[PDB]
Amino acid sequence: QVDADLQAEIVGKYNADLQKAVQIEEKKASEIATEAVKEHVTAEYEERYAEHEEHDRIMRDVAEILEQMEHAEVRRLI
Amino acid sequence: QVDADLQAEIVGKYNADLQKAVQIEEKKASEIATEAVKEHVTAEYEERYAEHEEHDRIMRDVAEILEQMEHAEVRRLI
């Protein structure tokens, strides 16, 4: 589904940050924080791969990795 | 915390829609769908109460109601 290297890179760098964002109990602030983490990661990869031939596939993978990370932490806390 | 009438109005109108959005298994589409429901509700209330004296309080209540609805359904499915 997703590129395993892309998954390792994003999980490695950003999972702890996304976890902290999800762990904020005040739900508005948590939503804002989670979105901020996602937006940063998306922008980092967009900048890095803007002209790459597999750009569209990469960006779909980044979006899926981020959503799976969020889902895993929401599940894990519940 | 939130105005009980505002809560009843938004839950009554939009909970089933937010539930369907959260229930979509494909996580990107679910995220897009949930955000679309939230954006509509926020815009409806912003338009209705743009000049009201309690606008800021109302809009914070709308944001909290929407986040609580999302949390309740994510919890309920898990």
Ligand SMILES: [Ca+2]
């Ligand atoms: Ca999500």
Ligand SMILES: [Ca+2]
């Ligand atoms: Ca939320």
